[PDB]
Design a protein around this ligand. Structure first.
Ligand SMILES: Cc1cc(Nc2nn(C3CCOCC3)c(=O)c3cc(CN4CCN(C)CC4)ccc23)[nH]n1
Length: 228
C-alpha cells in the first residue's frame, strides 16, 4: 500500500536540504530521493508524468521519510543558472509547458501548490521538468495581504516561474519583502526577459492580473502554451 519497509531502502548520500534529502536505492536497484523530516494518501493518488511521484512512506523509522522519484539534474532554478547561455527559446517554452501540464493536473484535482517556483521544480531525463513539493516574490496580491490561496494564486506564481525560466534563472525583483509588496500593490510588473517573445510576455502578464478572477486557469494556459 502506502508503506515502504525500512529494509527496502539504502541511504547513499545527502544531496541537499529542503529537511534532509538523500539519494538512495529502493530494493537495491532503483535510484530514489529519500526525504526525511492522511495527507500522504492524497499525495500518492496524485499521479502525473509532470509531477514528481511519491512512491511511498517509510513509517517504521524515526524520523519518518517519504520516498520520491529521483530527478537526476536537481532543481530547475540551479539548472537554469548553471546552463545559462545554452538555452533556445523553444526549450524554455517546453519547460513552461511541462510545469503547466503538472499544474493543470493539480488544479483539476483541487490541489493548491502554494509555493510554486523554479526552486520547487526538478529536472529529469531529456530535460523534462516536473513540479515538486506540492516567499513574497512569487505571491499574488491576495496571498501576501490576506493569505487567500487558490489555483489562481498558483497561476500568479506560475507567471513568475515563466519569468525565471525565460530569464535563465534570474532572481525576480532582485528587493525586500516590504518593497515587493508595495511594488506589486501599485501595479509594477516584472519586465520582459530577452528570450521571451511578445506573445509569451502577454501570457506572463495575464498571470499577473491583480484580480484572481482575471487570471487564466491552468487549463486555459495549457491550451495557450501548446498553441505556440
Ligand atoms: C524529491 C527529489 C529530489 C531529487 N533530486 C535532487 N534533488 N535536489 C534538491 C531538491 C530539493 O530538496 C533538496 C535536494 C538536488 O539538489 C539534487 C542535486 C543533484 C546533483 N546536481 C545536479 C546535476 N549536476 C550535474 C550535479 C549537481 C541531483 C539530484 C538532486 N529527485 N527527487
Amino acid at each position: 500500500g502506502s508503506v515502504i519497509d525500512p529494509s527496502e531502502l539504502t541511504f547513499v548520500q545527502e544531496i541537499g536540504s529542503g529537511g534532509l534529502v538523500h539519494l538512495g536505492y529502493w530494493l537495491n536497484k532503483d535510484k530514489v530521493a529519500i526525504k526525511t523530516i492522511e495527507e500522504a494518501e492524497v499525495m500518492m493518488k496524485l499521479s502525473h508524468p509532470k509531477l514528481v511521484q511519491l512512491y511511498g512512506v517509510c513509517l517504521e523509522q524515526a524520523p519518518i521519510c517519504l520516498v520520491f522519484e529521483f530527478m537526476e539534474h536537481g532543481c530547475l532554478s540551479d539548472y537554469l543558472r548553471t546552463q545559462r547561455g545554452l538555452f533556445a527559446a523553444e526549450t524554455l517554452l517546453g519547460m513552461c509547458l511541462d510545469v503547466c501540464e503538472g499544474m493543470a493536473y493539480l488544479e483539476e484535482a483541487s490541489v493548491i501548490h502554494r509555493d510554486l517556483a523554479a526552486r520547487n521544480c526538478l529536472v529529469g531525463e531529456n530535460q523534462v521538468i516536473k513540479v515538486s513539493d506540492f516567499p513574497v516574490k512569487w505571491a499574488s496580491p491576495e496571498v501576501f495581504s490576506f493569505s487567500r490561496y487558490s489555483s489562481k494564486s498558483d497561476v500568479w506564481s506560475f507567471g513568475v516561474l515563466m519569468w525565471e525560466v525565460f530569464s535563465e534563472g534570474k532572481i525576480p525583483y532582485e528587493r525586500s519583502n516590504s518593497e515587493v509588496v508595495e511594488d506589486i500593490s501599485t501595479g509594477f510588473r516584472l519586465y520582459k526577459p530577452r528570450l521571451a517573445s511578445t506573445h509569451v510576455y502577454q501570457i506572463m502578464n495575464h498571470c499577473w492580473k491583480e484580480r484572481p478572477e482575471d487570471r487564466p486557469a491552468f487549463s486555459r494556459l495549457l491550451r495557450q502554451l501548446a498553441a505556440i
